[model samples]
Target: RVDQTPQTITKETGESLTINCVLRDSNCALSSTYWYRKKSGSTNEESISKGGRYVETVNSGSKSFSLRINDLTVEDSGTYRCKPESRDAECAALNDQYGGGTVVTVNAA
Candidate 1:
C-alpha cells in the first residue's frame, strides 16, 4: 500500500488549513504522476480550489500533482491534499493504510 505523510505550518492569519498528501507510486516505475484538489466533502468531483483560489485551473502537462497554495491568504485556509496514482484499491489491500495529513491553525498578527 502507498503511504502518505503530511506536514503542518501556520500562516499569518487566524485561519485553519490542513494538508493531506502522499508521495508518488514509490513501488512502481511511472514516468509522471498528477495531483488535484477539491472541496473537503467533495469526492473527486471537480478541482475547484486550485492554487487555493476559487478559480478555473489550467492543468497542462503536469507530472507531479502536488496541491499548492500560494500567499497563504485567509481564504486559502482549508484542506489541501495529494493522492498517489493508486486509488482506494491500494489502501484497501493493506490491513491499515497510511494517510498523510496536517491541521494548520493560522493567527493574524
Candidate 2:
C-alpha cells in the first residue's frame, strides 16, 4: 500500500539525513506518519517520535512525510522506515502501510 525511495543510505558522525515517504494514493487522508528504527542485528524495532533527536514532518495535502535525524552518531546507525496510516474507506480499518526500508549506516568520524 506504500513505498519509499533510496532503499539504502550511508552517513557519517556529526552529519544528518532525511528519509521521505509517500502514500500510494494522493487522495487518501493520512491520519499519521510514523518513523521506525531498528538497530543493526536487533529484532526489536522502535518507533521514532518527534522531539529530542528526532523530527517528524508531514504534509497531508501532498500525502507525504519525512523523518529527519540530526547530529548523527554511530549508535544512530540502523534501519529507518516511513509508515503511512490512512483514513479512507478502503484502508480505513487496515494497518499502517510501510514504505521501503532505508538502511542507514553511520560511520564514526
Candidate 3:
C-alpha cells in the first residue's frame, strides 16, 4: 500500500466531514481515481451508483485525493472506498486496486 489506511471523519448534525483518501505515486500520469460508497448489505448487491459525484482527470499527472461532505445527516453512515486506476497486474492483487474505506457515521445531537 503506497498510502495509509482510509481516514474516517465525524461531525455533528449540521457540520461537515472530510474523508481523506490518498495514494502516493500511482506511477501513471494518465491514471484516474474514484470514490465509491458501499452500504452494509450482501456481497451480491452492488454499491450505490457513483452518479455524477466522481471527478475524472482530463489532463494527467494527478495524485492524492480527498472527499468532502457537508450538511451531514444520519443517513450518511457507511463505507467510503477509494479506488485508483492502474495498469500493472500486481496492482490489482491487493484489494482490487482500491483503498480500504472510511466509515462515516453521523450522530444525532
Superposition TM-score, candidate 2 onto the true structure: 0.88
Q: Summarize candidate 2's per-residue lDDT along 1-109 as a digit string, tens digits.
A: 5767678889889898888887865456778777788998899899786887687788877777777889999998888887776655677643545887999999989
TM-score of candidate 1 relative to the true fold? 0.41
RMSD of each: 7.2, 1.7, 4.1
Error of 1 at 13 (Å): 5.4
The candidate that wins on TM-score is: 2
How does candidate 2 score on lDDT? 0.79
TM-score-based ranking: 2, 3, 1
Find the 10 residues in a row with the least total lDDT in model 3: 50-59
Those runs of model 2 whose alpha carbons end farther than 4 Å from true positions after fitting are none
Lowest summed-lDDT stretch of 10 residues in model 2?
87-96
Misplaced by over 4 Å in model 3 are 2-6, 40-62, 86-95
Each prediction's TM-score versus the true structure: 0.41, 0.88, 0.63
Q: Provide the lDDT at 29 for model 2.
A: 74
Q: In candidate 1, which residue ranges exceed 4 Å CA deviation?
A: 1-6, 13-26, 30-68, 86-99, 106-109
- lDDT sort, best first: 2, 3, 1
RMSD of 3: 4.1
Error of 3 at 60 (Å): 6.6
